[PDB]
Amino acid sequence: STNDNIKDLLDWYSSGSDTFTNSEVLDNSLGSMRIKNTDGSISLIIFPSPYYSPAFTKGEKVDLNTKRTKKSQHTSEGTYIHFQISGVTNTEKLPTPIELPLKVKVHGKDSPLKYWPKFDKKQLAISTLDFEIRHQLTQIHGLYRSSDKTGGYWKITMNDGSTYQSDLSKKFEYNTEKPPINIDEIKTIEAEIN
């Protein structure tokens, strides 16, 4: 059996993420943005961190690799609205898609990857990297599914030696999220399930 916190995490990380490219900024206020996607829907995205406060202005183009916080709504004006959190970056692409170096260890023993995707974007929000990593861990390596796989961490080491890490026993800390990073400057990504 697992505890309730672990169950929330399984529900959160096993679900998918929303992806929209070349969306347009409609409004940008403190802690949020209103964006129009190319399919016609509107996205209301919250940004709770002072360290990652998107500064895009009305009319600019952005990419979304985000998660929904609740069910989308059809409004009176006939508008389809999405409610999401974080995950907004510029639209710059890399010359050729790259494969991020992810090494996974379960109980000290190396655990091979399956369906780890390639990325073609120059920058990704840390929350986006967090969900991609944990999603791989829950679908392929059993994270959160049983009591023997409920903790650990992931750590990203940049070329300059600076690091980013997240504790797997807790939800990603959105309130203190740092700004998006250049993925081609990532030296190593390690994930360990205790």
mmCIF file with all atom_site columns, C-alpha atoms in Angstrom, residues 82-182:
data_model
loop_
_atom_site.group_PDB
_atom_site.id
_atom_site.type_symbol
_atom_site.label_atom_id
_atom_site.label_alt_id
_atom_site.label_comp_id
_atom_site.label_asym_id
_atom_site.label_entity_id
_atom_site.label_seq_id
_atom_site.pdbx_PDB_ins_code
_atom_site.Cartn_x
_atom_site.Cartn_y
_atom_site.Cartn_z
_atom_site.occupancy
_atom_site.B_iso_or_equiv
_atom_site.pdbx_formal_charge
_atom_site.auth_seq_id
_atom_site.auth_comp_id
_atom_site.auth_asym_id
_atom_site.auth_atom_id
_atom_site.pdbx_PDB_model_num
ATOM 1   C CA . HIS A 1 82  ? -7.632 25.809 -20.750 1.00 0.00 ? 82  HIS A CA 1
ATOM 2   C CA . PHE A 1 83  ? -6.366 26.241 -17.155 1.00 0.00 ? 83  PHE A CA 1
ATOM 3   C CA . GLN A 1 84  ? -2.656 25.473 -16.949 1.00 0.00 ? 84  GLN A CA 1
ATOM 4   C CA . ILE A 1 85  ? 0.437  26.138 -14.836 1.00 0.00 ? 85  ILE A CA 1
ATOM 5   C CA . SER A 1 86  ? 3.914  27.270 -15.966 1.00 0.00 ? 86  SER A CA 1
ATOM 6   C CA . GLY A 1 87  ? 5.637  25.920 -19.110 1.00 0.00 ? 87  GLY A CA 1
ATOM 7   C CA . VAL A 1 88  ? 5.810  28.946 -21.411 1.00 0.00 ? 88  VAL A CA 1
ATOM 8   C CA . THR A 1 89  ? 8.985  29.513 -23.480 1.00 0.00 ? 89  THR A CA 1
ATOM 9   C CA . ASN A 1 90  ? 10.090 31.312 -26.662 1.00 0.00 ? 90  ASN A CA 1
ATOM 10  C CA . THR A 1 91  ? 9.661  29.572 -30.070 1.00 0.00 ? 91  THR A CA 1
ATOM 11  C CA . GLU A 1 92  ? 13.346 29.052 -30.992 1.00 0.00 ? 92  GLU A CA 1
ATOM 12  C CA . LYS A 1 93  ? 14.261 25.621 -32.376 1.00 0.00 ? 93  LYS A CA 1
ATOM 13  C CA . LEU A 1 94  ? 17.638 23.865 -32.398 1.00 0.00 ? 94  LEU A CA 1
ATOM 14  C CA . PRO A 1 95  ? 19.372 22.977 -35.735 1.00 0.00 ? 95  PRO A CA 1
ATOM 15  C CA . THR A 1 96  ? 18.668 19.265 -35.138 1.00 0.00 ? 96  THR A CA 1
ATOM 16  C CA . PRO A 1 97  ? 16.727 17.456 -32.373 1.00 0.00 ? 97  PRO A CA 1
ATOM 17  C CA . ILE A 1 98  ? 18.876 16.199 -29.501 1.00 0.00 ? 98  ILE A CA 1
ATOM 18  C CA . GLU A 1 99  ? 18.583 13.381 -27.005 1.00 0.00 ? 99  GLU A CA 1
ATOM 19  C CA . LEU A 1 100 ? 18.937 14.432 -23.385 1.00 0.00 ? 100 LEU A CA 1
ATOM 20  C CA . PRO A 1 101 ? 21.421 12.322 -21.361 1.00 0.00 ? 101 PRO A CA 1
ATOM 21  C CA . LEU A 1 102 ? 19.186 10.669 -18.757 1.00 0.00 ? 102 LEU A CA 1
ATOM 22  C CA . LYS A 1 103 ? 20.691 7.956  -16.552 1.00 0.00 ? 103 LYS A CA 1
ATOM 23  C CA . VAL A 1 104 ? 18.252 6.146  -14.281 1.00 0.00 ? 104 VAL A CA 1
ATOM 24  C CA . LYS A 1 105 ? 19.030 3.996  -11.245 1.00 0.00 ? 105 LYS A CA 1
ATOM 25  C CA . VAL A 1 106 ? 16.464 1.982  -9.302  1.00 0.00 ? 106 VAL A CA 1
ATOM 26  C CA . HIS A 1 107 ? 17.649 0.676  -5.929  1.00 0.00 ? 107 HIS A CA 1
ATOM 27  C CA . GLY A 1 108 ? 21.277 1.289  -6.944  1.00 0.00 ? 108 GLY A CA 1
ATOM 28  C CA . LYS A 1 109 ? 20.931 -0.820 -10.087 1.00 0.00 ? 109 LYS A CA 1
ATOM 29  C CA . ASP A 1 110 ? 20.933 0.901  -13.527 1.00 0.00 ? 110 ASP A CA 1
ATOM 30  C CA . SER A 1 111 ? 17.520 0.877  -15.253 1.00 0.00 ? 111 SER A CA 1
ATOM 31  C CA . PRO A 1 112 ? 17.411 1.335  -19.070 1.00 0.00 ? 112 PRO A CA 1
ATOM 32  C CA . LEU A 1 113 ? 15.201 3.898  -20.838 1.00 0.00 ? 113 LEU A CA 1
ATOM 33  C CA . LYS A 1 114 ? 12.195 3.241  -23.086 1.00 0.00 ? 114 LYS A CA 1
ATOM 34  C CA . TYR A 1 115 ? 10.524 5.788  -25.361 1.00 0.00 ? 115 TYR A CA 1
ATOM 35  C CA . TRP A 1 116 ? 12.636 8.681  -23.972 1.00 0.00 ? 116 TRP A CA 1
ATOM 36  C CA . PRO A 1 117 ? 11.853 11.359 -26.627 1.00 0.00 ? 117 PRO A CA 1
ATOM 37  C CA . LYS A 1 118 ? 14.117 13.758 -28.497 1.00 0.00 ? 118 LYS A CA 1
ATOM 38  C CA . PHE A 1 119 ? 13.683 17.517 -28.155 1.00 0.00 ? 119 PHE A CA 1
ATOM 39  C CA . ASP A 1 120 ? 13.921 20.205 -30.823 1.00 0.00 ? 120 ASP A CA 1
ATOM 40  C CA . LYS A 1 121 ? 13.397 23.295 -28.664 1.00 0.00 ? 121 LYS A CA 1
ATOM 41  C CA . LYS A 1 122 ? 16.237 25.566 -27.574 1.00 0.00 ? 122 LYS A CA 1
ATOM 42  C CA . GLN A 1 123 ? 14.728 26.194 -24.147 1.00 0.00 ? 123 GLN A CA 1
ATOM 43  C CA . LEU A 1 124 ? 12.473 24.235 -21.776 1.00 0.00 ? 124 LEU A CA 1
ATOM 44  C CA . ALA A 1 125 ? 11.021 25.319 -18.447 1.00 0.00 ? 125 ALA A CA 1
ATOM 45  C CA . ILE A 1 126 ? 12.358 23.357 -15.472 1.00 0.00 ? 126 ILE A CA 1
ATOM 46  C CA . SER A 1 127 ? 8.778  22.229 -14.635 1.00 0.00 ? 127 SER A CA 1
ATOM 47  C CA . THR A 1 128 ? 8.540  20.750 -18.143 1.00 0.00 ? 128 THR A CA 1
ATOM 48  C CA . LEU A 1 129 ? 11.798 18.819 -17.630 1.00 0.00 ? 129 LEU A CA 1
ATOM 49  C CA . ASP A 1 130 ? 10.471 17.698 -14.244 1.00 0.00 ? 130 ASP A CA 1
ATOM 50  C CA . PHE A 1 131 ? 7.311  16.229 -15.782 1.00 0.00 ? 131 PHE A CA 1
ATOM 51  C CA . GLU A 1 132 ? 9.101  14.612 -18.706 1.00 0.00 ? 132 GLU A CA 1
ATOM 52  C CA . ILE A 1 133 ? 11.585 12.931 -16.353 1.00 0.00 ? 133 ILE A CA 1
ATOM 53  C CA . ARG A 1 134 ? 8.982  11.800 -13.799 1.00 0.00 ? 134 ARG A CA 1
ATOM 54  C CA . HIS A 1 135 ? 6.595  10.644 -16.528 1.00 0.00 ? 135 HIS A CA 1
ATOM 55  C CA . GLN A 1 136 ? 9.339  8.353  -17.881 1.00 0.00 ? 136 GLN A CA 1
ATOM 56  C CA . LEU A 1 137 ? 9.912  7.129  -14.296 1.00 0.00 ? 137 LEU A CA 1
ATOM 57  C CA . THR A 1 138 ? 6.220  6.351  -13.623 1.00 0.00 ? 138 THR A CA 1
ATOM 58  C CA . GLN A 1 139 ? 5.427  4.722  -16.936 1.00 0.00 ? 139 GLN A CA 1
ATOM 59  C CA . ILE A 1 140 ? 8.587  2.698  -17.404 1.00 0.00 ? 140 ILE A CA 1
ATOM 60  C CA . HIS A 1 141 ? 10.252 2.312  -13.994 1.00 0.00 ? 141 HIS A CA 1
ATOM 61  C CA . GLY A 1 142 ? 7.307  1.916  -11.633 1.00 0.00 ? 142 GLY A CA 1
ATOM 62  C CA . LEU A 1 143 ? 7.662  5.178  -9.727  1.00 0.00 ? 143 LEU A CA 1
ATOM 63  C CA . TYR A 1 144 ? 4.756  5.704  -7.239  1.00 0.00 ? 144 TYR A CA 1
ATOM 64  C CA . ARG A 1 145 ? 3.030  2.449  -8.217  1.00 0.00 ? 145 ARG A CA 1
ATOM 65  C CA . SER A 1 146 ? 4.128  0.451  -5.152  1.00 0.00 ? 146 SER A CA 1
ATOM 66  C CA . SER A 1 147 ? 5.583  1.163  -1.685  1.00 0.00 ? 147 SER A CA 1
ATOM 67  C CA . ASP A 1 148 ? 9.160  0.286  -2.646  1.00 0.00 ? 148 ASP A CA 1
ATOM 68  C CA . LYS A 1 149 ? 9.398  3.132  -5.216  1.00 0.00 ? 149 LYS A CA 1
ATOM 69  C CA . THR A 1 150 ? 8.263  6.336  -3.548  1.00 0.00 ? 150 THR A CA 1
ATOM 70  C CA . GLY A 1 151 ? 11.337 8.581  -3.272  1.00 0.00 ? 151 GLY A CA 1
ATOM 71  C CA . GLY A 1 152 ? 14.677 9.660  -4.692  1.00 0.00 ? 152 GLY A CA 1
ATOM 72  C CA . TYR A 1 153 ? 15.577 12.684 -6.805  1.00 0.00 ? 153 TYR A CA 1
ATOM 73  C CA . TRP A 1 154 ? 16.607 13.867 -10.256 1.00 0.00 ? 154 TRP A CA 1
ATOM 74  C CA . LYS A 1 155 ? 19.557 16.193 -10.790 1.00 0.00 ? 155 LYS A CA 1
ATOM 75  C CA . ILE A 1 156 ? 20.511 18.234 -13.847 1.00 0.00 ? 156 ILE A CA 1
ATOM 76  C CA . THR A 1 157 ? 24.131 19.353 -14.095 1.00 0.00 ? 157 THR A CA 1
ATOM 77  C CA . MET A 1 158 ? 24.953 22.143 -16.501 1.00 0.00 ? 158 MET A CA 1
ATOM 78  C CA . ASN A 1 159 ? 28.284 22.554 -18.311 1.00 0.00 ? 159 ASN A CA 1
ATOM 79  C CA . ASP A 1 160 ? 29.434 25.185 -15.788 1.00 0.00 ? 160 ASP A CA 1
ATOM 80  C CA . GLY A 1 161 ? 28.765 22.800 -12.928 1.00 0.00 ? 161 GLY A CA 1
ATOM 81  C CA . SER A 1 162 ? 25.647 24.577 -11.671 1.00 0.00 ? 162 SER A CA 1
ATOM 82  C CA . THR A 1 163 ? 22.835 22.189 -10.691 1.00 0.00 ? 163 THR A CA 1
ATOM 83  C CA . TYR A 1 164 ? 19.049 21.831 -10.466 1.00 0.00 ? 164 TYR A CA 1
ATOM 84  C CA . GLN A 1 165 ? 17.420 19.039 -8.539  1.00 0.00 ? 165 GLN A CA 1
ATOM 85  C CA . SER A 1 166 ? 14.015 17.920 -7.341  1.00 0.00 ? 166 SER A CA 1
ATOM 86  C CA . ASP A 1 167 ? 12.888 15.522 -4.580  1.00 0.00 ? 167 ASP A CA 1
ATOM 87  C CA . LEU A 1 168 ? 10.682 12.704 -6.009  1.00 0.00 ? 168 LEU A CA 1
ATOM 88  C CA . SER A 1 169 ? 8.701  12.238 -2.781  1.00 0.00 ? 169 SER A CA 1
ATOM 89  C CA . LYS A 1 170 ? 7.144  15.689 -3.178  1.00 0.00 ? 170 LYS A CA 1
ATOM 90  C CA . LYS A 1 171 ? 5.419  17.678 -5.905  1.00 0.00 ? 171 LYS A CA 1
ATOM 91  C CA . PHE A 1 172 ? 7.653  19.979 -7.974  1.00 0.00 ? 172 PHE A CA 1
ATOM 92  C CA . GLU A 1 173 ? 8.056  23.334 -6.177  1.00 0.00 ? 173 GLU A CA 1
ATOM 93  C CA . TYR A 1 174 ? 6.265  25.640 -8.607  1.00 0.00 ? 174 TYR A CA 1
ATOM 94  C CA . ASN A 1 175 ? 6.410  28.610 -6.212  1.00 0.00 ? 175 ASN A CA 1
ATOM 95  C CA . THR A 1 176 ? 10.211 28.842 -6.479  1.00 0.00 ? 176 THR A CA 1
ATOM 96  C CA . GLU A 1 177 ? 10.727 27.622 -10.068 1.00 0.00 ? 177 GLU A CA 1
ATOM 97  C CA . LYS A 1 178 ? 13.818 29.075 -11.809 1.00 0.00 ? 178 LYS A CA 1
ATOM 98  C CA . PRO A 1 179 ? 13.771 30.463 -15.399 1.00 0.00 ? 179 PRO A CA 1
ATOM 99  C CA . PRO A 1 180 ? 13.838 28.121 -18.460 1.00 0.00 ? 180 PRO A CA 1
ATOM 100 C CA . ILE A 1 181 ? 17.210 26.688 -19.471 1.00 0.00 ? 181 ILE A CA 1
ATOM 101 C CA . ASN A 1 182 ? 19.087 26.059 -22.730 1.00 0.00 ? 182 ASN A CA 1
#
